[PDB]
């Protein structure tokens, strides 16, 4: 129950720094075993309900897609006849790690599991943190660098979710313990309709809450808010939250009722959390209201900035709706109902830029092939995580072009010179087998035809072939984004091919004993949990 | 140091309310508490 010193340092992402905790190796093995055991036993004993994210069943883009579908599948979610409103609020539970009381944590951990495990975990969070000549005992808050800290924080966050929702609404959302609901589904429409809180999720420390308000309850909420905190000078609009990257017509003015409902929703959610445990600050929030005035639903999940436009608003062609657009369907009428417009948030454009800056500052004393390798990893990670939204976002393409230019400039400065004629595209983008740098490209790089000729020596002459003479058109460096299947199509094919797999399993077990590897060759590289 | 001096910021009634909320939720879902990893428990080696 008494443990060693834990080293602490900072990792620099150039915009934020985070503490990294270095633990003694033998205790690392004990904590890794405890972590695996606790996650396994929590899964089989059904500790975590559906809203506790990240679950082991979605990639984060599939989480954003499922959230959009769960928004779209609700009852009358896009109707505004009786003046009703929709409020989606995204916020970040502030100082949850700093403000963990270890005695209360020990008690709650004793609630879910054996007291020896709880005692070990609480004694593990009380260690001495040392950095160089500085050292102090951590007796308040949790250590995020222990192996089992993910499980402990997901349990503590589940308790905070209970405090935000209330036990009745949490039981209604999570469903009965015998047959729990899936993600963003209810048992029937009566259970869904009864409470204003329609959807809820928590990604570690960020909660997304989706509320549906009829006219009278919204009126009562706004009346209570201005009764508690009056502001008669129309100063409530000064400082509200809205996204600027959406166009000059796609974003509309924010009226009295919308801003007042957003502030009332935030104040009501802040009134539920004890400040001695956690809070939601107004600067970390983003609230968007769907009303009769603005027909837009704004949120931003896992780095995708999503704007939802129901199709019962473009009846007179209000908006273009021609992009890399997720097309949302209704599960009742089985037809298209809303469109989701994707952008990459400017924070993640900054994260990619900071990753490239990290590459260029960790690698001045490195080889050119190392620069190309690190660049390839960064570009592939970006384009295979964002896909559609990377193509739609203009700022991301500008940043990608500038960062690729910086990588090539680092190679050039390495040689001695930055001379463009000295460096054809064949130097950089040749595959590494032929001695090239093997860079992958996400920029529009045209290849002049002077790099399409070759000499050959024969016994009766020497032939200087110039290919592409019949064209006056340059061949273009292949964009990486044309080799990555978009997310929406990948999800659709995943659903389709998994229903097919269940079909062949049903008519395979009433026949053979094992499914072969010939009937699933057509279904080989399909499915988000790939088959 | 400020937490040692200025006491637990989570007051006693707040901690009691949070504890009872967790208790009522956990009995409502009929949660079986996690045992200590037993001596035999085959899955141990795979988990290891």
């Amino acid at each position: 129950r008494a443990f060693k010193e834990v080293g602490i340092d900072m990792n620099d992402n150039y915009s934020t720094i985070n503490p990294v905790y270095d633990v003694e190796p033998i205790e690392k093995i004990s904590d890794a075993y405890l972590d695996q055991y606790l996650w396994y036993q929590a899964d089989q004993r059904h500790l975590f309900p559906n809203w506790v994210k990240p679950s082991d069943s979605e990639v984060p883009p599939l989480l954003v897609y499922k959230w959009c579908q769960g928004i779209n599948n609700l009852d009358k979610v896009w109707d505004t006849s009786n003046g009703e409103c929709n409020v989606i609020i995204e916020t970040q539970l502030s100082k949850v790690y700093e403000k963990i009381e270890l005695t209360l944590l020990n008690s709650l951990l004793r609630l879910i599991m054996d007291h020896n495990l709880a005692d070990y975990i609480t004694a593990k969070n009380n260690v001495t943190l040392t950095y160089k000549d500085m050292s102090h005992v951590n007796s308040y808050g949790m250590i995020r660098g222990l192996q089992f800290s993910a499980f402990v924080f997901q349990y503590y966050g589940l308790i905070l979710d209970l405090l935000i929702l209330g036990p009745q609404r949490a039981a209604e959302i999570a469903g009965p313990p015998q047959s729990p609901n899936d993600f963003l589904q209810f048992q029937d429409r009566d259970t869904e309709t009864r409470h204003p809180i329609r959807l809820y999720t928590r990604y570690i420390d960020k909660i997304w809450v989706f509320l549906r308000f009829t006219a009278e309850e919204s009126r009562d909420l706004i009346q209570r808010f201005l009764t508690e905190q009056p502001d008669p000078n129309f100063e409530n609009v000064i400082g509200f939250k809205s996204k600027k990257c959406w166009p000059r017509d796609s974003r509309m003015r924010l009226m009295r009722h919308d801003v007042n409902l957003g502030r009332a929703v935030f104040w009501d959610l802040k009134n539920r959390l004890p400040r001695s445990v956690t809070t939601i600050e107004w600067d970390d929030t983003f609230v968007s209201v769907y009303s009769k005035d603005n027909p837009n639903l704004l949120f931003s999940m896992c780095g995708f900035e999503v704007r939802i436009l129901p199709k019962c608003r473009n009846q007179n062609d209000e908006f273009p709706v021609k992009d890399s657009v997720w097309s949302l369907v209704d599960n009742s009428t089985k037809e298209r109902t809303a469109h989701a417009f994707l952008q990459v948030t400017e924070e993640d454009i900054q994260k990619f830029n900071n990753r490239i800056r990290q590459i260029l500052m960790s690698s001045g004393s490195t080889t050119f092939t190392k620069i190309a390798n690190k660049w390839n990893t960064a570009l592939i990670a970006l384009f295979t995580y964002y896909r559609e939204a990377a193509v739609s976002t203009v700022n991301l393409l500008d940043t990608i072009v500038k960062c690729e230019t910086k990588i090539q400039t680092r190679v050039k400065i390495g040689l001695n010179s930055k001379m463009p004629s000295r460096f054809p595209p064949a130097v950089f983008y040749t595959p590494k087998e032929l001695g090239g740098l093997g860079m992958l490209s996400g920029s529009h790089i045209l290849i002049p035809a002077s790099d399409k000729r070759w000499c050959k020596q024969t016994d009766v002459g020497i032939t200087h072939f110039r290919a592409g003479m019949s064209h006056d058109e340059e061949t273009l460096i292949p964009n990486i984004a044309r080799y990555i299947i978009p997310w929406e199509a990948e999800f659709i094919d995943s659903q389709r091919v998994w229903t097919e797999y269940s079909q062949k399993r049903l008519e395979a077990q009433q026949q053979n004993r094992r499914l072969t590897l010939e009937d699933l060759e057509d279904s080989w590289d399909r499915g988000l949990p790939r088959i | 140091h400020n937490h040692m001096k200025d006491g637990p910021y989570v007051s006693s009634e707040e901690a009691v309310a949070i504890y009872t909320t967790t208790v009522h939720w956990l009995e409502a879902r009929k949660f079986s508490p996690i045992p200590f990893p037993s001596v035999s428990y085959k899955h141990d080696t795979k988990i290891l």
């Binding site: 001695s276 | 400020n2 937490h3 006491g7 910021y9 007051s11």
Partner: peptide, 8 residues
């Protein structure tokens, strides 16, 4: 009988 938080 009111606590004083660290940030306040």
């Amino acid at each position: 009988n009111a606590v004083i938080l660290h940030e306040d």
